[PDB]
């Protein structure tokens, strides 16, 4: 009744064209409207074009209806129930640490560094300029030693 050893490799290597579905618990990023740039979880689906997204009390997005075209689905998804509420969604988000593993992917790090780079003050902008200047000095030194 089980699958022995064929499953553990064939299912994994299946490599479906479509991952990242619109199931409940899908972690998506809003990209249009007043909540653009914030993360949220699909909690359930009302129509093909409409969904309910709830950012748990972390991300700052309230539980609300949003058209699906305003979302960008991410890789991460939690196993929240069909009809779960905000409190259990927060509990599950914290337990799974899904937000942490998003702020580790290439997109999450890009967003984080972009945030702090645009938050940088004038002095630390100069500090970056100075540091890159020093790095360029060293890079030229070792490039010439390479020859």
């Amino acid at each position: 009744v089980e699958l022995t050893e064929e499953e553990k490799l064939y299912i994994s290597k299946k490599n479906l064209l479509f991952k990242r579905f619109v199931e409940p618990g899908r972690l998506c990023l809003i990209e249009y409207g007043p909540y653009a740039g914030k993360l949220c979880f699909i909690v359930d689906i009302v129509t093909i074009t409409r969904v309910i997204v709830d950012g748990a009390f972390i991300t700052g997005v309230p539980r609300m209806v949003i058209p699906l075209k305003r979302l960008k689905l991410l890789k991460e998804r939690i196993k929240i129930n069909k009809n779960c509420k905000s409190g259990f969604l927060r509990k599950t988000v914290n337990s799974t640490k899904v937000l942490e593993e998003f702020n580790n992917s290439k997109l999450g790090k890009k967003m984080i560094i972009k945030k702090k780079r645009d938050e940088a003050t004038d002095f630390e902008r100069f500090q970056v300029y100075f540091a890159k200047r020093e790095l360029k000095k060293k890079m030229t030194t070792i490039k010439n030693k390479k020859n």
């Binding site: 064929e6 479906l16 064209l17 479509f18 093909i48």
Partner: protein
């Protein structure tokens, strides 16, 4: 607009199938066929170790859903044409003037003469992967065979349509070359 609709096709025994971005290559003991379905929004899944191909359509309206079965039938036609070559048996019927068929360039390029005693040569060139030969059992027969059903059937149609009658009662002047039957080898 249905959310998801799928159809499954079974892969026969001696067939190798490679599908990449709905470009399909089917290889078998009668050669290799290729076919691109990039004109259709289709999610094609090929299961290699357990055979079968599933074509799935998300958010299909009836007009687009009509093409799922079309693609599946095309795939199964590639399978059968690669396992057992498609064969169109054609009969050349004639009333008073026998039709002289001559097959040249390695069972392509069939040329017929004496169509209604016209003493003018009408020749047709077979499509790629198609051979035309005379049947060994019944004399007024012609075999148009090959691995690709589109090419084979088009060659049969070309032979039929190259020999149409003009300026006569078509329902009395019945002579011509007609597809008698369709089968495989």
């Amino acid at each position: 607009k249905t959310i998801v609709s799928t159809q499954k096709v079974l892969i026969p025994e001696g067939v190798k199938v490679a599908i990449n971005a709905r470009k399909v290559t089917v290889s078998g003991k009668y050669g290799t066929l290729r076919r691109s379905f990039r004109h259709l929004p289709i999610d094609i899944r090929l299961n290699k170790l357990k055979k079968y191909i599933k074509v799935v359509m998300w958010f299909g309206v009836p007009d687009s859903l009509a093409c799922i079965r079309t693609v599946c039938t095309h795939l199964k036609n590639m399978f059968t044409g690669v396992t057992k070559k498609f064969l169109y048996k054609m009969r050349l019927v004639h009333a008073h003037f026998p039709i002289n068929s001559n097959i040249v360039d390695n069972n392509t390029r069939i040329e017929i003469r004496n169509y209604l005693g016209e003493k003018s040569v009408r020749f047709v060139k077979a499509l790629p992967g198609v051979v035309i030969e005379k049947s060994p059992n019944v004399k007024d027969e012609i075999y148009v065979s090959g691995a690709d059903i589109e090419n084979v059937s088009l060659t049969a149609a070309l032979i039929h349509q190259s020999v149409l009658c003009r300026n006569k009662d078509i329902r009395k002047f019945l002579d011509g070359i007609y597809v008698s039957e369709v089968t495989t080898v």
